[PDB]
Nucleic acid binder design. Structure first.
Ligand SMILES: [Mg+2]
Ligand SMILES: [Mg+2]
Ligand SMILES: [Mg+2]
Ligand SMILES: [Mg+2]
Ligand SMILES: [Mg+2]
Ligand SMILES: [Mg+2]
Ligand SMILES: [Mg+2]
Ligand SMILES: [Mg+2]
Ligand SMILES: [Mg+2]
Ligand SMILES: [Mg+2]
Ligand SMILES: [Mg+2]
Ligand SMILES: [Mg+2]
Ligand SMILES: [Mg+2]
Ligand SMILES: [Mg+2]
Ligand SMILES: [Mg+2]
Ligand SMILES: [Mg+2]
Ligand SMILES: [Mg+2]
Ligand SMILES: [Mg+2]
Ligand SMILES: [Mg+2]
Ligand SMILES: [Mg+2]
Ligand SMILES: [Mg+2]
Ligand SMILES: [Mg+2]
Lengths: 54, 88, 51, 100, 271
RNA sequence: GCUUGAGUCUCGUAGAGGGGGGUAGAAUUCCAGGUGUAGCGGUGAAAUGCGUAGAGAUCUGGAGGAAUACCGGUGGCGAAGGCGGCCCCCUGGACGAAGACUGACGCUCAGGUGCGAAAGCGUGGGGAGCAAACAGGAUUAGAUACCCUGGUAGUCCACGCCGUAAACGAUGUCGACUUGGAGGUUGUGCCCUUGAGGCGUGGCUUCCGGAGCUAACGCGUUAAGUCGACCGCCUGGGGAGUA
RNA sequence: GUUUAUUAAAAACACAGCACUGUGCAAACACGAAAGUGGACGUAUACGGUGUGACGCCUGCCCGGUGCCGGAAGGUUAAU
């Protein structure tokens, strides 16, 4: 569901600078936000998403 | 915690019949098994006070029940403390 | 961070940098000594926001 | 039983040596009681950031089910192999397929 | 294990002993012993050189293997025993072909574990292989200055050397002194750090403890007469001069490295 | 004797709960090299300080220490202190569904035992930034201060000691009863189930407020309201938490 | 514990401990015109020199002088 390989959708919760979008803006739930951020960090470590566009 | 298989084994060993989980004897057996299992975990590390707190919780309960039993059936009590090897 | 403006840019007017946070992160980070401060910077204005 | 999900990367140059790694690791996993539910490789693909100025590392994903001992020796195999770069081990995941 | 002696009598109050219950009580392996022939600090002319040496215990000698040239023949450690010729303990190793030798003892050697030497070998501590096939950033026991010569560096208790760079035909090493040195990549070195790291924690205590280790008293120069030391002289504890060695060379400074042949490999000096 | 207090068993859930090990990105500092040249830096304004023995700025390579930028919240966990990168091993507690089992096994607790921020002490390591003491430059009538330039202990690690904080919700623990409204977080049941929906039932948590209480401020189902069990503490200010 | 054999046994020397400093191994250093030897069949948890002298609490300010360490600027400067 929230696996770290699902790049083709996990782009929407990342800004142009690699920033994570808060739930206040996204509209997502709290538990889902937590697991989504954790999966984003995991994919970022495994080199699927960039830490920064720099 | 303890494994389901070990818990069922101890329950069937110490309780009278099936589903006899509330008996003081099975309570004592489960607490003793957990304490013995955690002995090695606390031999290693020995810096985990948060878990040692739960260990002390277990120890206090066993003692409280062992007393209830000794106040009911000294017989049962003695046999139990002999089986599990305690109450020095 | 980067500007990719269309071929007509006039005198190179910065329209996308201005819409972006510009100095959002810059101003957020240029401050110092974030140890004893945050415990007391907390909402309570949100509370005053009421009819 | 506690299943594991192994993901690892390889040097882009050693593209032809990945199948040997996969077929050798699958033997070690399945030796005692292992059983792979999801084996796949993405192969070459551009990286997000340059790991020591490298690109197009091979991504290999596996869903194994084996005890801590075999998986520990398998994990240190990565730490000591120079052809691999990164590694990750994740929980059960309930054996989902594809998800690419 | 470090143990503090109780203050029964003057001489035991400040004695700190190191206890190693996993050493061998019996006698050493006789076929690997030799004569030691204490010298007392005298050279072939009979003149005292390197003062403050004399006396001690009989101190037989053990033949320790430093070359470590046994390729493809695994060995198992039988036991650890005390060696009086060095600060580190030694391990007796038996090979599968029926030969016994002495080696230095890494930290986690214990007993009854396989040891592989030379050529390809596991990266586990204890094995020996050339640095051409050792990962960068790993601790090793005793490094050979030249290939096939024998480990010389970091051979003392609890000492180790870590590799910093391998690019080229040489390898950069950070020695315990805190200096960078280049060594040929073909030189061998065993993995880990030699054990007995509790060595400093001893305190000896009484003067006899140092006496029966072969160390004689040291007399301060200021306590002498001007005829036998640049210091000394004057009535009432006067010094009034720059410290020097008994032969007139300045101490507390005045670097004395005068080798122009080995400066090639000294990447950075001690700090 | 009994099962409603207390407890055990089965299936699940959330969480920076705790201990050990590993690894990743950004940035500061430092070292080597390349281009380059008169300033850099700092203040209210300056100076000290660094630089023509080539600084600052900029690019390449390398070393090492420390903390994990948003996510992040009228969020969560923990008895308290307190706990935020990611991954693995060991491990404690809490909550929900019914079902079964024991049968008062309970509450509180002087003495006693354990845990306990920061600073501090002992031994051995490590030491990039920050920074008591200390040095210099400023301001001032004076400035051993606020400001500026450096900078040691310390801050970090392992094992021991210290046992103190506005250690605060300035509110001891346990149990029962007493109108509501608006939120957050985490479970669960029924249904035209069309939906990011209707109707219920638990745990924790934020705000506003009724009766009541209170010297007042205010508290108000998480009481400072009505009661019960036990413990701790107070008797004008200073002297003094001192001899 | 040691000391002025034969007028001085001590508060003098040594001492365990502490600190600074040199030393990467053909180590520093010492004896030796040299070969060579000790250091050491040791390898920075090692060795040499210097000061202080168990242990407890501590060890403040000054780099102007002398010494030592570092410094592709500049001035002066031998042999050739
Ligand atoms: Mg001495
Ligand atoms: Mg005299
Ligand atoms: Mg003289
Ligand atoms: Mg005098
Ligand atoms: Mg004088
Ligand atoms: Mg339980
Ligand atoms: Mg008390
Ligand atoms: Mg502290
Ligand atoms: Mg300390
Ligand atoms: Mg320290
Ligand atoms: Mg300052
Ligand atoms: Mg108090
Ligand atoms: Mg607090
Ligand atoms: Mg508070
Ligand atoms: Mg109070
Ligand atoms: Mg109110
Ligand atoms: Mg007092
Ligand atoms: Mg005497
Ligand atoms: Mg005499
Ligand atoms: Mg010689
Ligand atoms: Mg003296
Ligand atoms: Mg004195």
């Amino acid at each position: 569901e929230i696996d770290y390989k699902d790049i083709a959708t996990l782009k929407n919760y990342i800004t142009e600078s690699g920033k994570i979008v808060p739930s206040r803006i996204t509209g997502t739930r709290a538990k889902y936000q937590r697991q989504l951020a954790r999966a984003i960090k995991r994919a970022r470590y495994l080199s699927l998403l960039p830490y920064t566009d720099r | 915690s303890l494994s389901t298989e070990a818990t069922a084994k101890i329950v069937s060993e110490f309780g009278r019949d099936a589903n006899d989980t509330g008996s003081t004897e099975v309570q004592v057996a489960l607490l003793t098994a957990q304490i013995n299992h955690l002995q090695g975990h606390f031999a290693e590390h020995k810096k985990d006070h948060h878990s040692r707190r739960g260990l002390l919780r277990m120890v206090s309960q066993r003692r409280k029940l062992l007393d209830y039993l000794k106040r009911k059936d000294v017989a049962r009590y003695t046999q139990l403390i002999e089986r599990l090897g305690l109450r020095r | 961070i980067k500007v990719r403006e269309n071929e007509p840019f006039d005198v190179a007017l910065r329209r996308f940098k201005r819409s972006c946070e510009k100095a959002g992160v810059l101003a957020e980070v240029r401050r110092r000594e974030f140890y004893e401060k945050p415990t007391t910077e907390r909402k309570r204005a949100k509370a005053s926001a009421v009819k | 039983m506690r299943h594991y999900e192994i993901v690892f990367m390889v040097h882009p140059d050693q593209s032809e040596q990945v199948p040997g790694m996969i077929e050798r690791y699958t033997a070690a996993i399945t030796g005692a009681e292992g059983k792979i539910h999801r084996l796949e490789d993405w192969g070459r693909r551009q990286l997000a950031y340059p790991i020591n100025k490298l690109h197009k590392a091979h991504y290999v994903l596996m869903n194994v089910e084996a005890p801590q001992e075999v998986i520990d020796e398998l994990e240190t195999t990565f730490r000591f192999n120079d052809a691999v770069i990164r590694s990750m081990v994740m929980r059960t995941k309930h054996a989902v397929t594809e998800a690419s | 294990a470090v143990v503090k002696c109780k203050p029964t009598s003057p001489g035991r109050r400040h004695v700190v002993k190191v206890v190693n219950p996993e050493l061998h009580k019996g006698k050493p392996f006789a076929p690997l012993l030799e004569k030691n022939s204490k010298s007392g600090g005298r050279n072939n002319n009979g003149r005292i050189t390197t003062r403050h040496i004399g006396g001690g215990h009989k101190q037989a000698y053990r033949i320790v293997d430093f070359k470590r040239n046994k390729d493809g023949i695994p060995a198992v450690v039988e036991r650890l025993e005390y060696d009086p010729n060095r600060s580190a303990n030694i391990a007796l190793v038996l090979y599968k072909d029926g030969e016994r030798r002495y080696i230095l003892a890494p930290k986690g050697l214990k007993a009854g574990d396989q040891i592989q030497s030379g050529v390809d070998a596991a990266i586990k501590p204890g094995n020996t292989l050339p640095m051409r096939n050792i990962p960068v950033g790993s601790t090793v026991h005793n490094v050979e200055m030249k290939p096939g010569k024998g480990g010389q560096l970091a051979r003392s208790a609890g000492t180790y050397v870590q590799i910093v760079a391998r690019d080229g035909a040489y390898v950069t090493l950070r020695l315990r002194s805190g200096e960078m040195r280049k060594v040929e990549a073909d030189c061998r070195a065993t993995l880990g750090e030699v054990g007995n790291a509790e060595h400093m924690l001893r305190v000896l205590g009484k003067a006899g403890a140092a006496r029966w280790r072969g160390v004689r008293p040291t007399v301060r120069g200021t306590a002498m007469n001007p005829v036998d030391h640049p210091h000394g002289g004057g009535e009432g504890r006067n010094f009034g001069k720059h410290p020097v060695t008994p032969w007139g060379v300045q101490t507390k400074g005045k670097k004395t490295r005068s080798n122009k042949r080995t400066d090639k490999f000294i990447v950075r000096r001690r700090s």
